[PDB]
Design an enzyme around this catalytic site. Structure first.
Site, PDB file in Angstrom:
ATOM      1  N   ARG A  51       0.767  -1.243   0.000  1.00  0.00           N
ATOM      2  CA  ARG A  51       0.000   0.000   0.000  1.00  0.00           C
ATOM      3  C   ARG A  51       0.804   1.303   0.000  1.00  0.00           C
ATOM      4  O   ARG A  51       0.315   2.326  -0.463  1.00  0.00           O
ATOM      5  CB  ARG A  51      -0.948  -0.001   1.204  1.00  0.00           C
ATOM      6  CG  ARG A  51      -2.029   1.069   1.176  1.00  0.00           C
ATOM      7  CD  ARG A  51      -2.892   1.013   2.435  1.00  0.00           C
ATOM      8  NE  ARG A  51      -4.051   1.900   2.352  1.00  0.00           N
ATOM      9  CZ  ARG A  51      -5.185   1.603   1.720  1.00  0.00           C
ATOM     10  NH1 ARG A  51      -5.324   0.433   1.109  1.00  0.00           N
ATOM     11  NH2 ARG A  51      -6.184   2.478   1.696  1.00  0.00           N
ATOM     12  N   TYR A  59      -0.492  11.493  -1.020  1.00  0.00           N
ATOM     13  CA  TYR A  59       0.023  12.563  -0.183  1.00  0.00           C
ATOM     14  C   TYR A  59       0.763  13.617  -1.005  1.00  0.00           C
ATOM     15  O   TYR A  59       0.707  14.808  -0.689  1.00  0.00           O
ATOM     16  CB  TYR A  59       0.922  11.996   0.922  1.00  0.00           C
ATOM     17  CG  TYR A  59       0.120  11.570   2.130  1.00  0.00           C
ATOM     18  CD1 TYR A  59       0.053  10.234   2.521  1.00  0.00           C
ATOM     19  CD2 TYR A  59      -0.633  12.508   2.847  1.00  0.00           C
ATOM     20  CE1 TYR A  59      -0.758   9.840   3.603  1.00  0.00           C
ATOM     21  CE2 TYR A  59      -1.440  12.128   3.918  1.00  0.00           C
ATOM     22  CZ  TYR A  59      -1.501  10.796   4.292  1.00  0.00           C
ATOM     23  OH  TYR A  59      -2.314  10.425   5.350  1.00  0.00           O
ATOM     24  N   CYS A 132     -14.609   1.968  19.361  1.00  0.00           N
ATOM     25  CA  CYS A 132     -13.570   1.245  20.067  1.00  0.00           C
ATOM     26  C   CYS A 132     -12.326   1.206  19.163  1.00  0.00           C
ATOM     27  O   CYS A 132     -11.208   0.975  19.630  1.00  0.00           O
ATOM     28  CB  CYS A 132     -14.063  -0.161  20.439  1.00  0.00           C
ATOM     29  SG  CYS A 132     -15.212  -0.018  21.864  1.00  0.00           S
ATOM     30  N   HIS A 166     -21.949  18.164  21.209  1.00  0.00           N
ATOM     31  CA  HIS A 166     -21.605  19.443  21.836  1.00  0.00           C
ATOM     32  C   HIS A 166     -22.128  20.573  20.949  1.00  0.00           C
ATOM     33  O   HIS A 166     -21.787  20.654  19.761  1.00  0.00           O
ATOM     34  CB  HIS A 166     -20.096  19.599  21.999  1.00  0.00           C
ATOM     35  CG  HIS A 166     -19.710  20.841  22.742  1.00  0.00           C
ATOM     36  ND1 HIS A 166     -19.721  20.917  24.119  1.00  0.00           N
ATOM     37  CD2 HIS A 166     -19.375  22.077  22.300  1.00  0.00           C
ATOM     38  CE1 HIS A 166     -19.414  22.147  24.491  1.00  0.00           C
ATOM     39  NE2 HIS A 166     -19.202  22.871  23.407  1.00  0.00           N
ATOM     40  N   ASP A 319     -14.489  24.803  26.319  1.00  0.00           N
ATOM     41  CA  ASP A 319     -15.726  24.642  27.074  1.00  0.00           C
ATOM     42  C   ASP A 319     -15.891  23.196  27.543  1.00  0.00           C
ATOM     43  O   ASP A 319     -16.313  22.942  28.673  1.00  0.00           O
ATOM     44  CB  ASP A 319     -16.933  25.044  26.225  1.00  0.00           C
ATOM     45  CG  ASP A 319     -18.247  24.835  26.955  1.00  0.00           C
ATOM     46  OD1 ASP A 319     -18.445  25.453  27.992  1.00  0.00           O
ATOM     47  OD2 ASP A 319     -19.068  24.050  26.492  1.00  0.00           O
ATOM     48  N   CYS A 347      -9.945  -3.752  27.295  1.00  0.00           N
ATOM     49  CA  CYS A 347     -11.036  -2.801  27.481  1.00  0.00           C
ATOM     50  C   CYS A 347     -11.435  -2.669  28.964  1.00  0.00           C
ATOM     51  O   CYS A 347     -11.607  -1.556  29.476  1.00  0.00           O
ATOM     52  CB  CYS A 347     -12.263  -3.253  26.708  1.00  0.00           C
ATOM     53  SG  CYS A 347     -11.988  -3.197  24.891  1.00  0.00           S
TER      54      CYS A 347
HETATM   55  C1  PP9 Z   1     -11.487   0.824  12.042  1.00  0.00           C
HETATM   56  C2  PP9 Z   1     -11.162   0.814  10.559  1.00  0.00           C
HETATM   57  C3  PP9 Z   1     -10.163   1.831  10.019  1.00  0.00           C
HETATM   58  C4  PP9 Z   1      -9.143   1.533   9.209  1.00  0.00           C
HETATM   59  C5  PP9 Z   1      -8.784   0.138   8.705  1.00  0.00           C
HETATM   60  C6  PP9 Z   1      -8.479   2.747   8.908  1.00  0.00           C
HETATM   61  C7  PP9 Z   1      -7.422   2.858   8.104  1.00  0.00           C
HETATM   62  C8  PP9 Z   1      -6.718   3.969   7.809  1.00  0.00           C
HETATM   63  N1  PP9 Z   1      -6.947   5.215   8.376  1.00  0.00           N
HETATM   64  C9  PP9 Z   1      -5.965   6.010   7.788  1.00  0.00           C
HETATM   65  C10 PP9 Z   1      -5.804   7.343   8.102  1.00  0.00           C
HETATM   66  C11 PP9 Z   1      -6.598   8.102   8.951  1.00  0.00           C
HETATM   67  N2  PP9 Z   1      -7.752   7.592   9.545  1.00  0.00           N
HETATM   68  C12 PP9 Z   1      -8.255   8.659  10.258  1.00  0.00           C
HETATM   69  C13 PP9 Z   1      -9.424   8.581  10.978  1.00  0.00           C
HETATM   70  C14 PP9 Z   1     -10.244   7.481  11.159  1.00  0.00           C
HETATM   71  N3  PP9 Z   1      -9.948   6.224  10.644  1.00  0.00           N
HETATM   72  C15 PP9 Z   1     -10.982   5.428  11.117  1.00  0.00           C
HETATM   73  C16 PP9 Z   1     -11.022   4.054  10.925  1.00  0.00           C
HETATM   74  C17 PP9 Z   1     -10.122   3.277  10.208  1.00  0.00           C
HETATM   75  N4  PP9 Z   1      -9.055   3.833   9.530  1.00  0.00           N
HETATM   76  C18 PP9 Z   1     -11.925   6.209  11.868  1.00  0.00           C
HETATM   77  C19 PP9 Z   1     -13.230   5.742  12.507  1.00  0.00           C
HETATM   78  C20 PP9 Z   1     -11.474   7.468  11.907  1.00  0.00           C
HETATM   79  C21 PP9 Z   1     -12.193   8.636  12.577  1.00  0.00           C
HETATM   80  C22 PP9 Z   1     -13.636   8.947  12.201  1.00  0.00           C
HETATM   81  C23 PP9 Z   1      -7.313   9.746  10.266  1.00  0.00           C
HETATM   82  C24 PP9 Z   1      -7.342  11.015  11.129  1.00  0.00           C
HETATM   83  C25 PP9 Z   1      -6.362   9.467   9.356  1.00  0.00           C
HETATM   84  C26 PP9 Z   1      -5.123  10.312   9.107  1.00  0.00           C
HETATM   85  C27 PP9 Z   1      -4.658  10.616   7.714  1.00  0.00           C
HETATM   86  C28 PP9 Z   1      -4.043  11.969   7.523  1.00  0.00           C
HETATM   87  O1  PP9 Z   1      -3.822  12.377   6.379  1.00  0.00           O
HETATM   88  O2  PP9 Z   1      -3.770  12.630   8.526  1.00  0.00           O
HETATM   89  C29 PP9 Z   1      -5.190   5.240   6.854  1.00  0.00           C
HETATM   90  C30 PP9 Z   1      -4.022   5.571   5.990  1.00  0.00           C
HETATM   91  C31 PP9 Z   1      -4.654   5.899   4.645  1.00  0.00           C
HETATM   92  C32 PP9 Z   1      -4.712   5.040   3.489  1.00  0.00           C
HETATM   93  O3  PP9 Z   1      -5.652   5.222   2.730  1.00  0.00           O
HETATM   94  O4  PP9 Z   1      -3.876   4.162   3.342  1.00  0.00           O
HETATM   95  C33 PP9 Z   1      -5.656   4.004   6.891  1.00  0.00           C
HETATM   96  C34 PP9 Z   1      -5.102   2.840   6.050  1.00  0.00           C
HETATM   97  S1  FES Z   2     -14.236  -3.587  21.817  1.00  0.00           S
HETATM   98 FE1  FES Z   2     -15.703  -2.103  22.656  1.00  0.00          FE
HETATM   99  S2  FES Z   2     -15.523  -2.198  24.854  1.00  0.00           S
HETATM  100 FE2  FES Z   2     -14.052  -3.679  24.046  1.00  0.00          FE
END
Ligand code: PP9
Ligand code: FES
Length: 359
Positions: A51, A59, A132, A166, A319, A347
């Site tokens: 990847r 980026y 989680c 909020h 706040d 957890c």
């Molecule tokens: C639980 C399943 C999740 C997976 C497998 C996951 C994977 C990623 N999250 C990434 C970046 C990111 N994920 C992000 C917020 C979240 N990511 C989330 C859930 C996941 N995020 C959730 C829920 C978020 C908040 C709502 C943030 C903040 C970035 C940061 C990337 C950046 O440019 O700063 C990247 C790197 C980007 C890419 O496309 O390769 C991957 C692989």
């Molecule tokens: S995975 Fe949600 S409390 Fe453990």
């Protein structure tokens, strides 16, 4: 004047340069708390290597890396200024950045906090809605930090583990949404469909009782009430990774789907994020708003600006912290309840870690 109250801002963090992508991805796919994978210790390195190239290119398309650090800082500093004024008794406040997969890591921040001799430590999640996979993983990291070294904290801990509704968060999105609507062709405004695009989650996480979808849905409702339903809307999900099932409908299929059905004016809203990063600047703004939009023949597709440097968002963080302190609570009531199908032994510990704090 020595810092008295420390605010640890938690978030995923992102690679600052293309050279930081690989290690970022390795840490990320190795994290069992984010999402589970068979033989994760060996599959993660494989995924990371495969990847890395396309993510580096993504980026490079948005400037050469993620700006999440600078926005987190701008927001933290703004929060501190208001806190020192709002809560005099809590002496000077200081924010600490705790990124989950890049420097500054959660573990490095905690060390600096301990080094500062703080009296109070507040784990302030930057994910408004709790999963989680996000806040949960970041909190588990705090617990395990002390658990590994096997020493008790030298400061009082508490946590603001979620803030999906909020009122100042709601006002920021509503404000940003109104300013976008003002920019569609006037005769097309009332036709614009508002698509709230939250990051998706695999069904393996959702089906265990993850609080995320319901909280996101809660943010959506509040915002639309504030906008008094001026436009039709839908809550869709973006950023699915891999072949397993994830919560849908997907934001891309949704945009494509609306466009092919006569709804060619779309307003995107990154409802689960606090700043711009790859998920918005690349996925929504280039991948969907430029490429997909052009191929499907969209008339107008825009995106509400991210919270980023909005003064009101900074007012929201302060706040929340002030109210948190005044309340003396150790965590939200929801944190005292783990997923009904939780199969993660940590957890229980993390939960107890915050509910155990004295004072
Ligand atoms: C639980 C399943 C999740 C997976 C497998 C996951 C994977 C990623 N999250 C990434 C970046 C990111 N994920 C992000 C917020 C979240 N990511 C989330 C859930 C996941 N995020 C959730 C829920 C978020 C908040 C709502 C943030 C903040 C970035 C940061 C990337 C950046 O440019 O700063 C990247 C790197 C980007 C890419 O496309 O390769 C991957 C692989
Ligand atoms: S995975 Fe949600 S409390 Fe453990």
């Amino acid at each position: 004047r020595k810092p008295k109250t420390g605010i640890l801002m938690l978030n995923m963090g992102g690679p600052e340069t293309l050279g930081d992508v690989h290690d970022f991805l390795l840490r990320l796919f190795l994290d069992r708390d984010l999402m589970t994978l068979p033989i994760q210790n060996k599959l993660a390195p494989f995924i990371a290597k495969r990847r890395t190239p396309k993510i580096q290119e993504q980026y490079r398309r948005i400037g050469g890396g993620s700006p999440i650090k600078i926005w987190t800082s701008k927001q933290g500093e703004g929060m501190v200024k208001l806190l020192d004024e709002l809560s005099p008794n809590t002496a000077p406040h200081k924010y600490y950045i705790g990124f989950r997969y890049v420097h500054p890591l959660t573990e490095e921040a905690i060390e600096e906090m301990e080094r500062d001799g703080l009296e109070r430590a507040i784990a302030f999640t930057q994910y408004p809605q709790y999963s989680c996979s996000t806040t949960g993983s970041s909190l588990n990291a705090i617990y395990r930090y002390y658990n590994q070294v096997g020493r008790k904290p030298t400061m009082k801990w508490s946590t603001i583990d979620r803030w999906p509704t909020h009122h100042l968060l709601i006002q920021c999105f509503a404000d940003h949404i109104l300013k976008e609507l003002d920019h569609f062709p006037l005769e097309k405004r009332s036709e614009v469909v508002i698509l709230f695009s939250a990051h998706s989650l695999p069904m393996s996480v959702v089906n265990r009782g993850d609080p995320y979808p319901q909280e996101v849905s809660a943010t959506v409702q509040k915002v639309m009430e504030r906008l008094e339903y001026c436009n039709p809307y839908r809550l869709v999900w973006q950023s699915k990774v891999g072949p397993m099932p994830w919560l849908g409908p997907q934001t891309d299929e949704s945009i494509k789907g609306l466009c092919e059905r006569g709804r060619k004016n779309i307003l995107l809203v990154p409802i689960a994020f606090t700043s711009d990063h790859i998920k918005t600047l690349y996925e929504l703004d280039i991948e969907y708003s430029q490429v997909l939009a052009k191929e499907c023949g969209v008339e107008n597709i825009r995106r509400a600006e991210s919270l980023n440097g909005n003064p009101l968002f900074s007012k929201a963080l302060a706040d929340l912290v002030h109210s948190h302190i005044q309340s003396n609570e150790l965590c939200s009531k929801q944190l005292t309840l783990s997923c009904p199908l939780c199969v993660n032994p940590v957890c229980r510990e993390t939960k107890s870690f915050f509910t155990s704090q004295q004072l």
